Amino acid sequence: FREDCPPDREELGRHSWAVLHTLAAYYPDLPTPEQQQDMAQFIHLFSKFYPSEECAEDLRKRLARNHPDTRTRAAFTQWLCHLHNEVNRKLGKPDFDCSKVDERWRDGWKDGSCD
Amino acid sequence: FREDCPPDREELGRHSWAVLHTLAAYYPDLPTPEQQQDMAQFIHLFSKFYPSEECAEDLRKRLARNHPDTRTRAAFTQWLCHLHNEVNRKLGKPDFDCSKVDERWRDGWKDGSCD
Numbered sequence: 001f002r003e004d005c006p007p008d009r010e011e012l013g014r015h016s017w018a019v020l021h022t023l024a025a026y027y028p029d030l031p032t033p034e035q036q037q038d039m040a041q042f043i044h045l046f047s048k049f050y051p052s053e054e055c056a057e058d059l060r061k062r063l064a065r066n067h068p069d070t071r072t073r074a075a076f077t078q079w080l081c082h083l084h085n086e087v088n089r090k091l092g093k094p095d096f097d098c099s100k101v102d103e104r105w106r107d108g109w110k111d112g113s114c115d
Numbered sequence: 116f117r118e119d120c121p122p123d124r125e126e127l128g129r130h131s132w133a134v135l136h137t138l139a140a141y142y143p144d145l146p147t148p149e150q151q152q153d154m155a156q157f158i159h160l161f162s163k164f165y166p167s168e169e170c171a172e173d174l175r176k177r178l179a180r181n182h183p184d185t186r187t188r189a190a191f192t193q194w195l196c197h198l199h200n201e202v203n204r205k206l207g208k209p210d211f212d213c214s215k216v217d218e219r220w221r222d223g224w225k226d227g228s229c230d
């Protein structure tokens with residue numbers, strides 16, 4: 001009942017996905033080489049500091065199997081959506097339909113339900 | 116009424132502070148030089164990608180006035196709390212008492228109200 005408490009593993013995850021997907025959503029469609037490098041490093045460093053040890057370890061192993069594609073906004077928003085679906089699948093959750101990532105994290109549902 | 120919508124500036128901020136303060140809260144008390152460097156760069160790169168343009172610009176100017184202290188968990192959790200209070204003050208919000216940052220973001224209130 002008290003809101004202003006340290007987030008548990010689940011609440012930190014929902015915050016963290018919101019942050020990651022929203023950052024990805026506004027990433028350039030034609031990012032410069034430095035931007036492409038900087039976003040790869042950001043994600044690397046996120047994985048180093050993520051504070052749930054079980055989450056961060058599994059994450060670092062995934063990232064070794066699957067390097068972030070930061071070539072464009074389209075590639076990177078998709079990459080990250082596929083990343084998040086691995087974790088969903090691991091945890092017994094359904095796949096999120098990655099064709100919806102712009103509606104979900106940038107533009108709002110096309111039916112106007114976020115307006 | 117629909118939860119699964121792109122966060123607005125305020126909702127992204129509350130997610131982002133939760134992430135930043137929770138990362139800081141679990142940062143080492145005696146971090147290695149590389150960890151100290153990595154956390155400085157993480158914060159730098161966060162400021163590059165933060166997607167509210169007005170927020171990110173003001174943030175990058177603050178960070179130029181006030182470089183992150185990543186020497187220890189104590190110094191860095193305090194630094195970040197002072198950073199967040201600048202933004203609070205800017206926006207007409209009261210100061211958060213920085214002596215409470217461990218209770219708020221790591222340990223829970225000492226009265227046990229998060230238990």
Ligand SMILES: Cc1cc2nc3c(=O)[nH]c(=O)nc-3n(C[C@H](O)[C@H](O)[C@H](O)COP(=O)(O)OP(=O)(O)OC[C@H]3O[C@@H](n4cnc5c(N)ncnc54)[C@H](O)[C@@H]3O)c2cc1C
Pocket residue numbers: 009010011012013014015016017018021050054055056058059080081082083084085087088091093095096098101104119
């Ligand atoms: C990097 C990272 C690693 C994690 N690793 C673990 C772990 O190893 N073990 C563990 O127990 N927990 C882990 N978590 C926490 C976990 O992934 C969830 O955040 C938590 O279980 C709560 O899940 P949820 O059902 O509320 O929705 P979440 O998975 O938090 O998702 C939040 C919202 O994102 C949207 N969404 C869902 N899937 C996608 C997608 N693929 N692409 C774009 N949007 C999507 C949906 O709207 C959903 O409601 C991790 C979190 C992060 C950020």
Ligand SMILES: Cc1cc2nc3c(=O)[nH]c(=O)nc-3n(C[C@H](O)[C@H](O)[C@H](O)COP(=O)(O)OP(=O)(O)OC[C@H]3O[C@@H](n4cnc5c(N)ncnc54)[C@H](O)[C@@H]3O)c2cc1C
Pocket residue numbers: 004124125126127128129130131132133136165169170171173174195196197198199200202203206208210211213216219
């Ligand atoms: C890096 C960054 C820069 C931003 N810049 C702007 C900007 O320029 N203009 C703008 O309008 N919005 C900005 N925001 C959004 C803004 O700071 C708030 O997140 C948003 O206004 C909602 O505020 P809130 O009252 O819900 O609480 P928030 O400020 O989001 O705080 C969330 C919670 O953190 C705790 N808290 C509050 N202060 C501290 C503290 N100092 N230390 C530790 N914990 C604390 C409290 O429990 C509070 O409920 C920024 C957000 C971030 C993350």
